[PDB]
Amino acid sequence: MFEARLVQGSILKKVLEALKDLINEACWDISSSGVNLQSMDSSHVSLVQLTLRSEGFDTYRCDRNLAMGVNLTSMSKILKCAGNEDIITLRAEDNADTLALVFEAPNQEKVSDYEMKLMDLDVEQLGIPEQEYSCVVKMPSGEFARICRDLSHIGDAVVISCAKDGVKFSASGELGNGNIKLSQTSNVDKEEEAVTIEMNEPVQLTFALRYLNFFTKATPLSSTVTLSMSADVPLVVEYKIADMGHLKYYLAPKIEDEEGS
Amino acid sequence: MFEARLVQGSILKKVLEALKDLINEACWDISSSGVNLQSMDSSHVSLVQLTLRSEGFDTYRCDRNLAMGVNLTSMSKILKCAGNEDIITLRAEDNADTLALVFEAPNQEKVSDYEMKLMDLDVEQLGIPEQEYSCVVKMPSGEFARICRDLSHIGDAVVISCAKDGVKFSASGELGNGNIKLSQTSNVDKEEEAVTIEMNEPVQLTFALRYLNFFTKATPLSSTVTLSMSADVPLVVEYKIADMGHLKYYLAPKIEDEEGS
Amino acid sequence: MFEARLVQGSILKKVLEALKDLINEACWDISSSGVNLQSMDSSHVSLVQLTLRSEGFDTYRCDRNLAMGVNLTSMSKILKCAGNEDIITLRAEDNADTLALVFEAPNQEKVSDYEMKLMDLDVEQLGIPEQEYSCVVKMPSGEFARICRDLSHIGDAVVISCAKDGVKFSASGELGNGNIKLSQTSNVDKEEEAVTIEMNEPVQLTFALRYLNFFTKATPLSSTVTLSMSADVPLVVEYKIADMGHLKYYLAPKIEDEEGS
Amino acid sequence: SSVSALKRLERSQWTDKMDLRFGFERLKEPGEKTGWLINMHPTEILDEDKRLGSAVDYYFIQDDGSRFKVALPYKPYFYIATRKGCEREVSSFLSKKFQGKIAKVETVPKEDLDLPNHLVGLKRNYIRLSFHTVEDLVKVRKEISPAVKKNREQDDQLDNIVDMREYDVPYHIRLSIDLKIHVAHWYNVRYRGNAFPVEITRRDDLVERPDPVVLAFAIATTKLPLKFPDAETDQIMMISYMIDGQGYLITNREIVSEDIEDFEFTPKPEYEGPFCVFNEPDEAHLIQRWFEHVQETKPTIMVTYNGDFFDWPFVEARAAVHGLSMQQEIGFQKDSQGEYKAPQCIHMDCLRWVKRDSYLPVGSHNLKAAAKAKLGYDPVELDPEDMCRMATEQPQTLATYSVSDAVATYYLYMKYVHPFIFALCTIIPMEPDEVLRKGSGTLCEALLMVQAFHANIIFPNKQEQEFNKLTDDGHVLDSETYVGGHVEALESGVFRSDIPCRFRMNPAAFDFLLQRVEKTLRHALEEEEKVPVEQVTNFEEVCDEIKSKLASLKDVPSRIECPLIYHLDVGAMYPNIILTNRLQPSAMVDEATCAACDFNKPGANCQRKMAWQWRGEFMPASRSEYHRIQHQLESEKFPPLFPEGPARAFHELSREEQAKYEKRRLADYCRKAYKKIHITKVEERLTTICQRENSFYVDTVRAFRDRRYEFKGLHKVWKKKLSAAVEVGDAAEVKRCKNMEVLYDSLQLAHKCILNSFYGYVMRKGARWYSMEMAGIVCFTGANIITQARELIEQIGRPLELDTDGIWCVPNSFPENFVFKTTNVKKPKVTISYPGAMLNIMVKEGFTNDQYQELAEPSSLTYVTRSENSIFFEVDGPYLAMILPASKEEGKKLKKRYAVFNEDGSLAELKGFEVKRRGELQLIKIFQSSVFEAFLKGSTLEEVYGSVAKVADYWLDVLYSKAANMPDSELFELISENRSMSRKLEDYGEQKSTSISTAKRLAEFLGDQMVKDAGLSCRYIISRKPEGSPVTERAIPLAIFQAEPTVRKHFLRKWLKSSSLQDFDIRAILDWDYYIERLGSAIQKIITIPAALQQVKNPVPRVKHPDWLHKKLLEKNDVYKQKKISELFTLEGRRQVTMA
DNA sequence: TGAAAAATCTAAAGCATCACCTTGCT
DNA sequence: AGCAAGGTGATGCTTTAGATTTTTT
Ligand code: SF4
C-alpha cells in the first residue's frame, strides 16, 4: 500500500506542465528512498529524471519496492484541478488498477476524491553513470527561459561555447544568425540571482534547439538552473530548489556527421 | 413604450453573457411586473426563465405587455461594447424597429447611443407551476463554477446525490471517475461563503454536464447560487442578482431505462 | 558604418510591433537628420511615415546617406529579446548586407548581439503635402482603442462627424447601428487624458475600420493620439514617440461610390 | 502555298499506295457494289478541275472477303450570323474578298434554340459558307474569329457579322452528320465516274456482320533489373500475335537459350490458340519476319493492350535504329496526340475500354485483373524482375507468358470490345478508333449533333469558361458550382439476415400505409405491369393479407426482428428525372426572355418552378472595389511574362494570365482589408423549366430509353433461342442466333452507356449543351427522392446507407412480395414487390409532373398537357449480409465503402475496398481478403465478431512473434513496399519522401546508373535502428540483402547511424511498430470501430480504440437516452411572436 | 518511361476553429 | 495578484491541379 501527503502540490502541477508536451506516458518507481522517474522520451534521444525523495514529501508511507506506469495525458490534465495552495493525498494500492487521489482545499471544508486506471509498461532501463563535467555554470532560470525562447526562432540548432571570458550561445537560420554573451557577476547578495562558473577547459558543443525550448517549460519550478557539460558528453541541465530537490535532464548532443565526407 | 434605468451596469452585461452561450432564440416580454424571458434552446434539452421586477430599476414605466423577439446568436456583443460601471438606459418604442440603449460614463463625458433591430421568430411557451420543493443546496457561485469546470474534463454526464452526510457531485467516463463531497457548514458566520441544505429524502439522480458548463457563466454576477433538484423533476439552478432580479436555468433529468421491464 | 545607442529600448519594440502586422516590406531612409521610414501596404491604401530625430538618441554616429531594404518581419521577431528598460544599439557596415543589433541589460550582465541578412528593395517615393487641416483632435489612446475594438464587430466602415459640439463615431451594419459621442473636456488639471478638439468647419468623413484596427496597434507607444482630417483629405493618425519623434498613419477615406448596380 | 499543296498531294499518294498494298483498292470503275463500312478518313482527292479538294475515304469490306475503298468529296462549311437588312451585302462582300477560296455561300433559314419567342415558329436566316479544303476552313475561321470576338465583347463589313457557329465540328464528323453514314452498316456504293459523285445508300435488309481480319500482338522485351525497359538501350526478345484465332510467335535467337516447338494454349475450352513458332537469329530478322507476315496477312484491325504508349513506340524505335522504318512498311505513326494510328487499319487497345466502359474498379485496369473479371480465367503470373533470367534458364515459361498475354488481349478484343465498339458507333457518327479514344462527353455531343441536325437547329458553341465572373450582388466569384449529392453511412457494422436487429418504429406511418394499400396495389398494377385491375381474382385477398400483416405489426412498434437488407435503387434515376421534368439545356428560362414570348398568358400552364441548391466561393469585394482595383491596374504596364519579348500592353497579354494576376492582386488586398478572404455561400435557387420547348433533347433520351428496352427484349428472346439452339445442337442456326444475341447485347450495352452519359455531358466544362442549372436540378431532385425515401424507410426500419443512386436499407414480418392470379392467358401470374410499390406511389404523389406539355400538331400551335412520371424504384432482393466499415472523415469526401453478400453466400457487391497494385502491403490485402469472407461465420452478433476477429488475431500473432515461424522469401514478399519514380530524381530538388530516400540509397549503393534514366522501381522496408529520424528517412532498400556480404555490412553500418550492433538479420532491424500501426489501423477500420459502434465489447484486445471513438460513442450512440423538457414539464402552448 | 490519353486519386496548400497565459492594470 | 483577449501553435475539414497512388515490362 502506498500513501503520500503533500501540501505544496503546485510543484507537481509544474512538473506535469513541463513534461506534458514531451512524453505521453512515463515510468515511476517507489522505494524506501522515495519516488524516481528515470525515463527515455518518445523520440528516444535523451534521458529525464524526477527525484522526489522521502523527506521532500510531507508524509510518506511505502510498504514495498514497486514500479508503475502512468500516462501523462490524463494525470497532467486532472492535476489542472488545483490552483496554487491545495493539498494532495495520493494512494497506490497493491493489486488494484485504480490509483486514488484526495484533494483538500485549505478551507477545511472542501474534499475531493478521484480514481485512475493504469496500464502495463515495458521500457528498457538505461544505466546511470557519474562522470566529471569540465564546465559548470549556475544561472537564474528566467534568463535561461528567455534566451532559449529568443533563440527558438533563429534555427533548429544551438552552439554552446564555454571560454575563459564566459559563456556564449549561437544560432543560425534563414532569417539570420545571432550569438549571445553572458559574463560573470560577483557583487550581488542574492544567490538565486547570482551566476557562477567553474571551468577546466573551453567547451564547444552543438545541440538541438526546439527540444530545449520544449524543456524550458520547467521555469516556474525553480528560480536557478545549473548546466554542466564537457567534450563528447550529454549536457546535464538541473533545476534545484532551496527546499525541494532537483529536476535533471541528460541531453545527448547532435550527431555531427559530415554528409559530404 | 418602456424605460429602464440602471446605475451600475455590470450586472446586465453579466446576465446577457450568461444568456449568450446556450441561447440562440429569445423572446423578451415586458409587462407591469417587469421584464421576463422564457426561452427554449434549439438543442431541445434545457430551458431558461429570467425575471427583473419593476422596483429594481431606478426610473421605470410600462404602458402594456410587449414582446420582442431578439436573437442571441450574435446579440450580446453590442452590450459587450460598453464599460463596467456605466449607467445604462433602455428605451423601447411602441412600433418602431429600434430599441435604444444609452450609456453614460461616471464623469458625465463619454456618452454612447446604440440601436437594436427586431425580426420575427417562433417559440414554444411553457408555463411554470409552483410545487412542493425537496432538494435545495445553497452554495457560493465561484465554488459551483469551479467544480463544474473541474468535472467537465471527466465526462459529459454528472451524478448528483443528496444524503445525510451532505451532497456529492460526480462524473465518469473512459478517463475514469470522480466524486466530490461537501458537507454543511458549522462554525462560520459570513453568508457569502457558507453553504446550506434543505432535504426531504436522500436522492440519487443524473443530469447532463455540458449544459451545466453553459450554466456557470454567472460567476461575478452574484456570490450566491442555489441548486434545486427532486425525483423526476428537472434540475433548476437559481441565481439571485442582488436585491435586483432573479434567473432560473432548467435542465432535463437523466434516469435509467427499464427496457427489460 | 552607422552606430546608434539609446538608453531606452522599449520604445523601439513598441514602434516595431506597431509596424509589424501593417507593412511587410519597408525602405528605411537614413540620413544625418535622423531615421525616416515612409512606406505603404501591399493593398496600396495605408501609408506610414515614421520620423526619429537625432536629438533623442543617447550616442549617435553617422557617415552619410544610406538606402535600406529590411523586411519588418525579421527584426519584429528578433526584438522580442529586448528587455523592459534595456540599452538598445543598432550597427550597420559601410558596404555589407547585414545589420547588427546590440542589447545591454541595465546591470551590464546580459549582452545580446544579433545580426541579420538583407534583400534589395524598390519603393516608389510619395512625399506628403503640407496643407492646413480643419478637424484636429487630441484624444487618449486607450479610449480610442476601446471604441475601435467596440465598433469593429458592429459594422465595417465608420462615419466620423466633427462639429463644435464634439466628435461622433457612427456605424451601421447587420447588427443595427450606433454612435458614440465625445465632447470637449476643459475642467481637468492633467493633460495626458484631456481630450481637446480644434475645428475650422464641421465635417463628415467615412473610413474603413480594418485599417483603423491596424493603426490602433500603437497603443502602448504613446498616451495620446492626434487625428487630423478635412474634406477629401486622408486621415492622419499621429503618435508622438516621446519628445524625439513622430509616427503618422495616413489613410485614404473609403468613398464606396456605388453605381446603383 | 504551293509547297504545302505538293506535300499534301505526296501524303495523299503515299496513303493511297499503302491502302492499295493492303487490299483496299480505290474504286475506279463505273459500277455498283455492296459493302460493310470499317473506317473513314479525311483525305485529299483530285477532281476534273485538278485543284485542291477535300474528301472522305470510306473503307468497305465484303462478305466474300474482298475489300475496297471509295472517296466522296463534300465541301466543309460553317455558319455566320449578321444583323438584319444587310445579309446580301455581307454575302457579296465575303464572296468578292475571299476570291477563289469560298466555294459557295447562301442564306439558310434555321431555327435557333435560344431565340426569344422562338416557340411560335420564329426562325433566323443564317448564312452557310463552304470551302474546298479543311485548311481553307481553318484559315477563314481564324480570319473571321477576331471580328466576332471583338463584336461579342464590345456588346469594314466585318462589324455586321455578329455571331459565328459550327467551327469545332470535325470534317469526317460533319460528313457523318450530313449523309448519315455510320460505320458497321451495310451499304450500296454506286460509282458512275469522276463527273457524277458516288452514291452511297444504307441497306437494312442484311443485319449479319462480317468478320474482319484482326491481329492482336504483344511483346516481351529485355529489361535491365530494377529499371523500366528503355527503347534506346534494349531490344525486343520475343513477339506473339494472333490472327483470327491462329497463333504466331517470333523469338530472338541471340537472347533465348533453346528452341521452342509449336504448341497450343487453351485457358478455357472456348479460348483456343495454336501457336506456330518462327525462330529468327537476330533482332532485325525478328522485325523483318513480323513486318513480312503482317504484310502477307493484310489485317484491317490491329489490336493490343496499352500499345500506344508501350508496345507501338518500342517497336518503332527498334525499327528506326535498324534502318527500315516502321511507317513505310506497316503504316503506323505517332500523328499528333501521341496516338499510333494507321491510314489503312483501325488500331485498338483494350485499355481505353477497360477505363471507360468496363465498369471495373480503379486499380483493376491491368490486363491480369481485367481478364480475370471479364474472360473468367486468371493469366499466368511472372514478375518482370526475374523475366530477363527466363531468357537463359528455360524459355518455356516466358513463351507461355507471351502467348498467354496474346490470347488474353485477343479474346478480350473479340468477346467484349469488338461488338461493343461496333454497336456503339452505329449510333455515334465517329470512327471506331475515335469512339475508343475520347470520353463519353464527346460521344454524347456527336450524338446530340445527329439529333439536332435532324431537328434542323443550329449548334451552340462550346462553353468558353468566363474568368472571374461577377455574381448578382457584385462579388468576384472564384468558384461556382452546384451542390451535388454525396454518400453517407448512417450506420456502420455488420447486418445479417440471421442476427436480429432492434427496430424502433412509429405507428403514424403505419396509418399512412394502411388505408393507402388499395391505392398502392392499384397503382402498382395500373402502369408498372400494364394489367387492368378488373381481370384479377385475389385482389381483396391480398389486400386483407396486407391489412393482417400491418395490423400484427401495428400493436408492437418497437421490436427485435431479423433484417431484410434491401437496395432501393432507382432505375437510371437521372435520365428518368430529365424525361419527367422535361429538362432541356435551353428550357431553363429567366423572366427577361420568358416574358418576351406569346405564351405567357394569365393561367398558362407552361412554366415549371423547380428548386436547386447553388454553391459559390467569392471574394468579399463590391463592384466599386473591383472597378477601382482595375483602374489602379491600368495605370501601370504589365511586366514581361516570358523573356522572349518586351513589356506587355493591354491588348498584348491574354485573358487567363491577367485574370490570375487580378485574382492575386485582389486576394492580397482583401487579406488585410477584410476579415474573410473567401466567402462561401450555399443558397437555394429556383429556376423555370419551359415545358413547351423544342423537344429534341427529351425525345432523344426517351427514344434511347425505349430502344434500350426493345433491345433488352430482343436480347432476352434471342438468349432463349440460343438456349434452345445449344439444347438441340445444330450448326448454322446456332451460330446465327449467337451472332444475333451478341449483336443485341452489344446494342443494349451501348444504349445503357449513352443513357448514363447524357447526365454527365451537360455538367462537362466546355460542352456545347452546358447547364449548371440541370446539374443542380437533377442532383436536388435526386437528393429529394433519397431524402423522402429516407424518411419513409427510417420510420418503419433502419436505412443503413444513403448512396447517390439509391438506399441500402432494412423487419422479418414486413411484406415482401405477392403473386396475383390473372385471367389473361399471356400473363397468368403477376409478381409484385410491396417495398417497391410504396416508394412508387410515394414518387407518384410527390414528383409527378402534371403539366408535361407536348406539341400535338404544328398547324395551330396546339400543345397537349399530360401527366408523366417515369421515375421508378427497384428492389434488389433480400441480400444475406451487408458490412459497412467506419472512417474518421464525415462529409462530402466520404467514400462509398461497403460489402454486400448474396443469399447463396457469394459476393454480391463490394465497393471502396480497392486493393492497390503496389501501393499497399501484401499483409493489408490478405487481411482484407480474409476478413470479408470471415464476417459470414457465427450465429449471433458476438459470434460474428469473435469469428471475424480471428484473422486479426492470427496476423497480430504473426507480427508480434517477430515472424519466427515464417520463411524468409515470403517475409519479404509480404512486408515490402513497391513504389515507382515517375520522373527525374534530381529535378525534384531537396524535398522529403520515402521514395526519394530509397532512390538515394540505391544511387549511393550501385552508382548513378540507377538514376541516369527515369522510371526507377524501388522496393523498400522501413528499419527501426535510427530512432528519432522521420518515417521517410528510415527507408532502407532491398537490393542490399542479396548483395555480397561486405557491402551489405558497410551500408547497414552507415545507414542505421550506428557502429556497435552485432546482429544484422532481417528480424533484428525491422521496424515492427510501423507495421503494427498500419495493420491496427486496418483492423480499426473493419473490425474494431464497427464493433464499438454496435454495443459490443472489443474482439481484439491488442488494438485500442482511438480517442475520437471514445468521444463519439458518448455523444452520439450511448447506452442511455437523454430526455427533454416537454416530456417532464407542462406546456403552455404555441404562440407566434410577431414584430410589434 | 513518357503520358495527358483520361478521368479517378491524393497530397500539399488552404482556411476555419480551439486554446490559455502572457503585455498593461485594476 | 488575475482580467481582455488573442495569437501563434496545433487540428480538422476543403480543394484543386498535376504527380502517382495507373497502364505496359
Ligand atoms: S415557360 Fe411559358 S412563358 Fe416561359 S418561355 Fe416557355 S412558353 Fe414562354
Residue numbers in the entry:
A (entry chain C), B (entry chain D), C (entry chain B): 1 to 261
D (entry chain A): 27 to 181, 213 to 867, 869 to 1198
Q: Would you copy out the relevant sentences from the publication that reported this structure?
A:
Replicative polymerases (Pol), such as the leading-strand polymeraseε (Polε) and lagging-strand Polδ, synthesize DNA with extraordinarily high fidelity. Polε-core interacts with the ring-shaped PCNA sliding clamp to assemble the holoenzyme.
The third intermediate is in a mismatch-editing state. The T/P DNA substrate has stronger EM density in this state than in the first and second states, indicating it is a relatively stable state of the holoenzyme. In a wild-type Polε, the mismatch would have been cleaved in this state, but because we used the mutant Polε exo− in this study there is no cleavage. There are three separated primer bases in the exo channel, similar to previous studies on B-family DNA Pols. Unexpectedly, the template strand is scrunched by 2 to 3 nucleotides, such that the frame-shifted and melted template and primer form two mismatched base pairs (P-2:dT with T0:dT, P-3:dT with T-1:dG) and two serendipitously correct base pairs (P-4:dT with T-2:dA and P-6:dT with T-3:dA). Therefore, the P-2 and P-3 bases in the exo channel are protected by the out-of-register base pairing, allowing only the mismatched primer 3′-end to be cleaved. The structure of the mismatch-editing state reveals that the β-hairpin is too short to interact with the template and to keep it separated from the primer.
